[PDB]
Design a protein around this ligand. Structure first.
Ligand SMILES: NC(=O)C1=CN([C@@H]2O[C@H](COP(=O)(O)OP(=O)(O)OC[C@H]3O[C@@H](n4cnc5c(N)ncnc54)[C@H](OP(=O)(O)O)[C@@H]3O)[C@@H](O)[C@H]2O)C=CC1
Ligand code: SF4
Ligand code: SF4
Lengths: 90, 62, 363, 119, 216, 72, 150, 386, 199, 135
């Protein structure tokens, strides 16, 4: 059983404006300090939309769809949950 | 009364994106209203007005 | 000066954010009439100065009535001190007074409120030199040859103000009705919460009651009209009624089935009110005291109090006085009877009862 | 037999049917009768007498149904009645035959540098 | 009802491989092939469900919206049992200025979808209350904010604006601050709406550079 | 006078009380503070043709600088 | 310890004698203000030490043995009209547990244009007002042009 | 088409900001018609006149009980159309502070539900830990409630040194605080009899009624957006899912408590896995640069000038993103025309959907249970009325 | 405990169901039936003689003899951080000159529209404001102004106790902002000496 | 997942879990079996015959039913079918009943009645990383 309201020096010993250690906060990638080219990394202005062909005279073979599905307790495969979202090295 | 028009290119810049040149690209026709009586606050001096149609066109109507 | 007061600095359509360019100081602003006067002036976009003697608690309702920087509160006003008055009108080209008293006090007499203070105020107004309109208020029953001391002081103060300031406008309304008026409320406190209601003599004296919002629009029009400066305007309703008729209509409004009023000789009424009027002095004043228990009221009830023939009235302002006997002004007094759903025992009200109910009770 | 089946007259008849309950519930016994209340509702209809789409009339009737329904459940207090119903009538019958002999253009000129907008 | 707690163990996985692959690559084509009449336009978008996939968007007439929603909720491959919301967008440039939006969630297969119908101010939209209970208040709010009517509704009335408010504030032509303002009056003792007036008028700032290419 | 009231000391009088600063070189760097991140953006101000009588004043901070290095 | 308690009480109340204290009007107001009385009699009288005194005469105390959020407390000298606005900023940070710096251990830099701390003037007629207010010494007409005078 | 005729029963439940009109044939409720819009501030139209960064504080005051969750959905919706990847440390901080926010929302919700039921001690007790977490918020953003901490591409500032120490210290006793909190209601016959079998909801109705958050979990439904459609570092996090099968107020109470337990577990896991690195996306053309960088570089100064005046131009498009809010599923629909202001921003609130269930749920109930229905619904009208 | 019992259900459909159907027995979450005299006595002790109220009572009573977290304002204050966003203020340079250079970034960024700026060139050629007003009754204290300013001119000071009796007193002008900055400069500079490592 | 009650529940017996998650109360008091699912699938296949043979909707529904029937045939233990289909048997019974009920409205509306040259505009979205990241 833990008690609320600790006594002095057991909680928030130092005020935020008096940190005993100087703070070194990075503000740029070491890879990008001197290589500052941007076109290789302009994802925003390079996305695309395309108008595909008229999807009228297409042949949807549901046979191939259902041939790729399992039939037993085994042989069942599940897509793992991704751990994190993409970071691209940062 | 209302004014249907496209604002002309500003003399300050050589930009031409917000002009009739790229007409099919972006909606570039604006509807405006005649400005209405405006005055100043006696206590602060801020501009005082009662126009309901003061900015709805220059901000939205494109 | 003629119309430059209402036209030169008018900015905006006339709303709350608009500016009328009019600076005025109102005395007795927290009073019944002065509150509506101030609310009427400021709502058009005017600067209002409100000096007060009573509590800030009683005055906070006035704060909302104006926009930021247009309500001026001056506490601890001393009518015997001219310094506060000079500060109150140091920027206002318009002066409006509604400071009035109905009962004498050991610390203030009728003369002190009704003669000397308005006289000194008019003197200082003329000394300012930038004031364009001085608005003073009196009673329709004010006359120099009346037995009533308050009416006589009112008339004397009006004459003194006229002599001091030639261009001041005198307003003499009659009975003024309202939610917190001093006419209907005391009549209710006398009809109800009391054993019996005295009525002076026959009580057939004729009065012309009026509505407060008509008075506020009248003040606005008087500021609009230049010709009214230096004149006297009387305000009254579109009807002439007696005290008996007013009492009967009030009883109908209250739907009281028991006439508690009595017609008594004036000397009997005076003797009833004699003991409490010889002790009116040497007393700081008491609450819950009707202004009606005075000999001056009895003298008022012995004479007619209506607009004089040929006097300047609402028609001169292009103003039609609304109905006071009924209308929106009669709803607040109807809220004593909540307008009437199930109150009382009355049956004569069967006129307005719904259809099927009367066939249920077969009349 | 009537334009667009005459749905407008049916709507007016329905509102007139529902009218007296509004008068009794909102204490308009001492201001108005059924007749001039009906006249008020009639004048409300005249705002759009020249509409040429049945669909627009249907949507107008539907929004009027909503207005009369929020009138029915007392959702708009007595102040709404004051500001839209009886005081406008008193003003309409009150400023009759005004004594101003100036033209409306000259009235506007003497009013301000811009025309008045809003109610 | 679906998505019942079946496994007592922790799940490190999302859906099955075949179902996810279909729903992310051939779901739109399946929709197109199944009910092409219900299909008018196809866009596979930024995958509302997750940042790494693709998800479709549906455009159709209001006529077949109800059967399309019925199929989308009830089809064995599309079990979209959760209709997130119904809203609309204003396109004043177009002949039809309104784009009503319909969003679905499929907890059966961890998927989502968007359905849109483009209409004008005077065309009815059949209500989806019979398909989803939640559409009632969403239709109410959409009507309140734009005036988009929904035929056959139990009771379509305003839900968010003032009691006596006329007009639809989310319209592009609707003023930002409006026409009326409300204040209390001592004289009438009543709180009354008055013509709108501002001590300081709003300041609109034009930052849009004349060089930006992304403007559309 | 538009914004300041009374005979309080104006910021103009305050900055007028600071004598110009003598610095070696031809170009000076102004940050507005000892630590650059606490002041204004760095400014490079020309020092040639400048004297104690006619120094170069900071466009960001109003501080004056001059150098007796331009052969004078 | 009664003698130590009374010594602390005298050094906190700022008076010279227990008779001078109990007979002073400050004690009488302490008989009606429970917060002020609690200051004078309980918190200042416990285990702890004085820290320093500002130019307003207020005293600062700290007690490391107390729990967090309650280690530091101040006694206002103005016993009848105590107000937090009179605390100088150089004690404000240590009082607000924002920094561990106080004048008694930190030598700050004082600007020549520094304005001292004092009581608020709100609710008074001497308080600040905008230049377009009626209380201003000279009213301003903010019209952005000059009117022609004949 | 409809007259009034029979007046009979009439009720008015509260102008004070929920207005409720009910219908009883006596002691048992037959109809309940809420009326809303008393807090409708018209924010969605207001959003159109603000830049993406300008409109961010609007999302603080949509759910003023849970703020960072509200920020997160809008930020993700922006970034996905912007095609921007978030750094790892920023994701860690976002997830941890989101868990703390969820803890605050659960605490305040349960305490208010108790006070409405009649228990006042847990209210006061839990507000102390709520003040502790408010101190945590102020240390990191300078605001107790409306932090505006989350940013497109990361966060405004990095965590100050010494914060995780106090976070762990708080977690070291938060379990004890929760335990002492439970004993006041958990083993009580009165609390159960007030809460048991009141407002029963099915899975079929819930999916018909669009439920989300803990209410969904209490119907035997296996669903967490953090496990089905994970965002940021939630996929890495390992935690359990409380499951109930009655749809009861007591069940929802227990579900929320176990959700708090799982949130504490995630807080611990985040505390012991905090990485070192960048907290903002390295794209200066969207993310503001450092002040030190701005004051010594022309390019960063120009980008600071442009972003802080005009802001980045989102490419034209549309997207909708949702976040597993403590009150359910909070989603925002974003419509992009190509400019620096969002063309149309629709906001989806789970409480608004939950509030629609009153009429069908309150049927057959009693006036002592309407307050129970509202309290267990866990509804904030700020998100309900936007 | 979290177990359920027949009759302790708060409804009628469920109560009527359990007293006329044994469906609750199939539910494992319902406490199982007592099987001997000992279990019957345990159940009686559970229902009668309370024994459930007693535990919470004892815990609350222990809380009575427990410590408190109450603070004595105004003689005690809370804990805050340098990042605290309070009253907006205008800063100067140590020589005495205003930091603000009227770049109007603060007005441009402010989503509250609470900043009104007018400026022109000073008589010495300096670019200084002629009108600098911020509406505190309209300011939302977001601090975005403090983020946008590149010369550290506008800052939200550590002052938070500045309530006024009238609304007009909060219409902050250039002069009052400069007064506030001159008052609170040292604290703000000290906080910046810490915040510089993060900002 | 996590049980909320303070008591220990085995949950390995499937019917105990079914009681806990309230399938008996809210979805189906009757335990679903393989035979009931077979009956439902056969009914759906019989019901879908109202659609024209030339409709792709009928084709897809038939393919789904055939796959489900193959799953039911090749699997004996019902828990195996649960593992295959990632749900419970009662859920599948509800699915099949819903799909059968969907048929009459589709038949009454017949979306397949479109011109031979019916045109469907298709728009696809391409990510920037397609051309930016490693091919
Ligand atoms: N029907 C009517 O009511 C009629 C009214 N009038 C005039 O209208 C004016 C107001 O009428 P009404 O408002 O109804 O009466 P009220 O009594 O309601 O107004 C009284 C006002 O006078 C102020 N006042 C009186 N004596 C002094 C004083 N010695 N020093 C400072 N303030 C003082 C009061 O201040 P405090 O509140 O501090 O007492 C109060 O503000 C009066 O002057 C009256 O003569 C004229 C004819 C009829
Ligand atoms: S306060 Fe800062 S950002 Fe605002 S105008 Fe002045 S220098 Fe520019
Ligand atoms: S803190 Fe926010 S609201 Fe206040 S002035 Fe700065 S930007 Fe405007």
């Amino acid at each position: 059983f833990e008690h609320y309201l600790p006594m002095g020096l057991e909680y928030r010993k130092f005020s935020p404006g008096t940190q005993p250690v100087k703070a070194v906060v990075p503000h740029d990638s070491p890879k990008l300090v001197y290589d500052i080219k941007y076109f290789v990394r302009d994802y925003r202005r390079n996305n695309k939309y395309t108008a595909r062909t008229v999807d009228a005279k297409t042949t949807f073979d549901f046979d191939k769809l259902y041939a790729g599905m399992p039939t037993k307790p085994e042989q069942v495969k599940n897509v793992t949950r991704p751990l994190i979202m993409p970071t691209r090295g940062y | 009364k209302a004014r249907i028009y496209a604002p002309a290119r500003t003399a300050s810049q050589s930009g031409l994106a917000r002009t009739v040149d790229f007409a099919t690209t972006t909606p570039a026709w604006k509807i405006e209203f005649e400005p209405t009586a405006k005055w100043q606050n006696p206590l602060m001096g801020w501009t005082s007005s009662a126009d309901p149609l003061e900015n709805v066109g220059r901000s939205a109507l494109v | 000066y003629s119309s430059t007061l209402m036209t030169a600095d008018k900015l905006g359509p006339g709303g709350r954010s608009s500016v009328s360019g009019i600076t005025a100081t109102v005395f007795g602003a927290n009073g019944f009439l002065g509150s509506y006067i101030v609310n009427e002036l400021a709502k058009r976009g005017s600067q209002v100065v409100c000096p007060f003697r009573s509590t800030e608690n009683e005055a906070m309702h006035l704060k909302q009535m104006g926009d930021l920087g247009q309500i001026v509160l001056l506490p601890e006003l001393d009518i015997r001190n001219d310094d506060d008055i000079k500060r109150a009108i140091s920027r206002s080209n318009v002066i409006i007074n509604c400071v009035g008293m109905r009962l004498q006090t050991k610390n203030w007499s009728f003369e002190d409120v009704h003669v000397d203070f308005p006289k000194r105020l008019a003197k200082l107004a003329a000394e300012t030199g930038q004031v364009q309109r001085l608005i003073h208020f009196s009673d329709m029953g004010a006359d120099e040859n009346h037995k009533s001391l308050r009416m006589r002081t009112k008339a004397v103060g009006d004459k003194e103000v006229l002599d001091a300031f030639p261009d001041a406008t005198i307003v003499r309304p009659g009975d003024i009705v309202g939610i917190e008026d001093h006419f209907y409320n005391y009549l209710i406190y006398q009809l109800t919460l009391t054993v019996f209601a005295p009525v002076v003599e026959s009580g057939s004296n004729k009065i012309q009651p009026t509505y407060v919002l008509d008075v506020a629009d009248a003040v606005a029009a008087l500021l609009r009209k230049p010709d009214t400066a230096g004149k006297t305007l009387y305000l009254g309703g579109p009807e002439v009624l007696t005290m008996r008729e007013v009492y009967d209509l009030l009883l109908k409004t209250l739907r009281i089935y028991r006439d508690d009023t009595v017609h008594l000789p004036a000397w009997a009424v005076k003797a009833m009110y004699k003991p409490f009027d010889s002790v009116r002095r040497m007393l700081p004043g008491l609450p819950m005291t009707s202004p009606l228990a005075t000999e001056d009221y009895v003298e008022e009830m012995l004479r007619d109090k209506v607009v004089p023939a040929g006097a300047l009235g609402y028609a001169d302002l292009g103003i039609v006085p609304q109905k006071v006997t009924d209308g929106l002004a009669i709803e607040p007094v109807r809220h004593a009877r909540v307008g009437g759903y199930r109150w009382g025992d009355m049956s004569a009200v069967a006129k307005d009862i719904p259809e099927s109910v009367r066939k249920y009770y077969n009349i | 037999k009537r334009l667009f089946g005459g749905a407008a007259r049916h709507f007016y008849f329905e509102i007139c049917r529902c009218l007296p309950f509004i008068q009794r519930l909102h204490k308009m016994e001492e201001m108005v009768s059924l007749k001039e209340l009906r006249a008020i509702v009639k004048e409300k209809f005249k705002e759009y007498k020249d509409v040429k789409d049945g669909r627009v009339v249907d949507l107008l009737i539907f929004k009027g149904r909503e207005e009369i329904e929020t009138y029915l459940l007392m959702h708009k207090q007595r102040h709404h009645v004051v500001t839209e119903v009886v005081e406008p009538y008193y003003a309409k019958q009150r400023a009759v035959k005004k004594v101003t002999t100036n033209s409306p253009f000259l009235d506007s000129f003497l009013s301000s540098g811009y025309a008045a907008i809003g109610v | 009802g679906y998505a019942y707690a079946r496994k007592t163990t922790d799940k490190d996985y999302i859906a099955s491989e075949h179902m996810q692959a279909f729903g992310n690559t051939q779901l739109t084509d399946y929709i197109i092939k199944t009910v092409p009449k219900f299909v008018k336009m196809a866009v596979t978008g930024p995958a509302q469900s997750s940042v790494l996939y693709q998800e479709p968007t549906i455009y159709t007439t209001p006529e077949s919206l109800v059967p399309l929603m019925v199929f989308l909720r009830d089809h064995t491959n599309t079990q979209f049992k959760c209709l997130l919301d119904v809203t609309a967008v204003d396109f004043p440039e177009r002949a039809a200025r309104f784009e009503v939006v319909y969003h679905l969630l499929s907890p059966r297969w961890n998927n989502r979808i968007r359905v849109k119908v483009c209409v004008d101010e005077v065309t009815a939209v059949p209500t989806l209350c019979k398909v989803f209970n939640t559409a009632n208040w969403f239709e109410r709010e959409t009507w309140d904010m734009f005036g988009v009517f929904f035929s056959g509704h139990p009771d379509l009335r305003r839900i968010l604006t003032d009691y006596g408010f006329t007009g639809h504030p989310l319209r592009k032509d609707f003023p930002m601050t409006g026409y009326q303002e409300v204040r209390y009056d001592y004289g009438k003792k009543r709180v009354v709406s008055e013509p709108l007036e501002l001590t300081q008028e709003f300041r609109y700032f034009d930052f849009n550079s004349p060089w930006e290419t992304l403007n559309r | 006078d538009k914004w300041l009231d009374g005979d309080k000391k104006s910021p103009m009088e305050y900055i007028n009380e600071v004598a110009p600063i003598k610095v070696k070189g031809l170009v000076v760097a102004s940050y507005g503070s000892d630590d650059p991140a606490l002041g204004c953006p760095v400014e490079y101000i020309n020092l040639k043709g400048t004297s104690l009588e006619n120094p170069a004043v900071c466009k960001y901070t109003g501080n004056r600088y001059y150098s007796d290095d331009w052969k004078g | 310890s009664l003698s130590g308690y009374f010594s602390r009480l005298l050094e906190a109340s700022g008076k010279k004698s227990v008779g001078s204290f109990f007979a002073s009007w400050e004690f009488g107001k302490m008989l009606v203000d429970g917060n002020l009385a609690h200051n004078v009699l309980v918190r200042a009288t416990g285990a702890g030490r004085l820290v320093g005194t500002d130019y307003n005469g207020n005293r600062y105390y700290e007690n490391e043995e107390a729990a967090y959020g309650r280690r530091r407390w101040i006694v206002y000298k103005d016993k009848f009209d105590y107000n937090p606005t009179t605390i100088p900023p150089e004690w404000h940070g240590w009082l607000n547990y924002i920094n561990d710096y106080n004048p008694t251990n930190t030598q700050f830099k004082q600007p020549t244009y520094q304005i001292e701390a004092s009581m608020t003037k709100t609710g008074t007629q001497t308080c600040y007002n905008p230049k377009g207010s009626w209380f201003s010494a000279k009213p301003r007409n903010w019209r952005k042009y000059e009117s022609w005078t004949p | 088409l409809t007259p009034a005729k029979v007046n009979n029963f009439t009720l008015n439940f509260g102008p004070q900001v929920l207005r409720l009109v009910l219908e009883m044939q006596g002691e048992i409720i037959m109809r309940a018609d809420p009326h809303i819009g008393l807090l409708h501030r018209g924010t969605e139209k207001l959003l159109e006149y603000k830049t993406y960064l300008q409109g961010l504080p609007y999302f603080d005051r949509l759910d003023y009980v849970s703020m960072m969750c509200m920020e997160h959905s809008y930020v993700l919706a922006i970034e996905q159309l912007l095609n921007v990847s978030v750094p790892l440390r920023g994701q860690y901080i976002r997830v941890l502070f989101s868990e703390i926010t969820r803890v605050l929302n659960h605490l305040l919700a349960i305490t208010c539900h108790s006070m409405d039921v009649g228990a006042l001690t847990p209210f006061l007790w839990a507000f102390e830990e709520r003040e502790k977490l408010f101190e945590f918020y102020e240390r990191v953003s300078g605001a107790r409630m409306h932090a505006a901490y989350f940013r497109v591409g990361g966060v405004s500032q990095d965590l100050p040194i010494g914060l995780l120490r106090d976070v762990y210290d708080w977690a070291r006793q938060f379990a004890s605080r929760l335990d002492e909190m439970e004993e006041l209601l958990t083993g009580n016959r009165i609390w159960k009899e007030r809460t048991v079998d009141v407002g029963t909801i099915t899975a079929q109705m819930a999916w018909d009624w669009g439920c989300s958050g803990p209410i969904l979990r209490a119907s035997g439904i296996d669903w967490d957006l953090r496990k089905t459609q994970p965002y940021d570092a939630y996929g890495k996090m390992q935690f359990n899912v409380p499951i109930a099968g009655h749809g009861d107020c007591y069940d929802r109470y227990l579900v929320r408590l176990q959700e708090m337990r799982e949130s504490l577990r995630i807080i611990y896991q985040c505390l012991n896995e905090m990485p070192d690195g960048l907290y903002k996306s390295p794209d200066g053309k969207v993310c503001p640069p450092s002040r030190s960088t701005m004051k010594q570089s022309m390019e960063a100064l120009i980008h600071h000038f442009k972003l802080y005046t005009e802001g980045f131009h989102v490419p034209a498009g549309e997207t909708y993103r949702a976040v597993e809010a403590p009150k359910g599923e909070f989603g925002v629909y974003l419509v992009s025309r190509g400019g620096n202001r969002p063309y149309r921003c629709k906001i989806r609130s789970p409480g608004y959907a939950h509030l629609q269930m009153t009429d069908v749920i309150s049927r057959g109930a009693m006036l002592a249970d309407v307050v129970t229905i509202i309290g267990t619904l866990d509804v904030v009208f700020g998100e309900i009325d936007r | 405990g979290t177990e359920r019992r027949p009759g302790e259900s708060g409804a009628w459909k469920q109560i009527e169901r359990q007293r006329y159907a044994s469906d609750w027995e199939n539910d494992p979450t319902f406490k199982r039936t007592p099987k001997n005299l000992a279990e019957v006595l345990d159940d009686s002790a559970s229902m009668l003689l309370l024994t459930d109220v007693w535990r919470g009572m004892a815990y609350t009573l222990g809380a009575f003899f427990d410590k408190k977290v109450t603070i004595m304002y105004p003689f005690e204050k809370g804990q805050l951080s340098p990042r605290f966003r309070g009253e907006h203020a205008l800063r100067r340079y140590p020589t005495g000159e205003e930091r603000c250079i009227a770049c109007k970034l603060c007005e441009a960024i402010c989503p509250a529209q609470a900043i009104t700026i007018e400026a022109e060139e000073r008589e010495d050629g300096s670019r200084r404001t002629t009108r600098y007003d911020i509406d505190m009754t309209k300011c939302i204290y977001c601090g975005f102004c403090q983020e946008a300013c590149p010369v550290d001119a506008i800052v939200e000071g550590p002052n938070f106790e500045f309530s006024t009796e009238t609304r007009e007193e909060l219409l902050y002008d250039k002069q009052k902002l400069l007064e506030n900055g001159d008052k609170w400069e040292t604290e703000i500079a000290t906080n910046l000496r810490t915040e510089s490592l993060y900002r | 997942f996590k049980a909320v009650a303070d008591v220990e529940i085995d949950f390995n017996n499937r019917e105990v879990l079914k009681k806990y998650v309230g399938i008996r109360d809210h979805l189906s008091k009757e335990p679903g079996t393989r035979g009931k699912l077979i009956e439902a699938l056969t009914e759906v296949l019989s019901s879908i015959k109202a659609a024209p043979e030339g409709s792709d909707y009928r084709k897809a529904v038939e393919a789904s039913c055939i796959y489900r029937l193959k799953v039911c045939k090749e699997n004996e233990s019902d828990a195996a079918i649960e593992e295959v289909l990632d749900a419970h048997l009662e859920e599948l019974i509800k699915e099949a009943k819903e799909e059968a009920r969907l048929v009459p409205l589709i038949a009454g509306n017949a979306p397949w009645d479109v011109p031979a040259d019916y045109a469907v505009p298709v728009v696809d979205y391409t990510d920037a990383a397609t051309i930016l990241d490693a091919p």
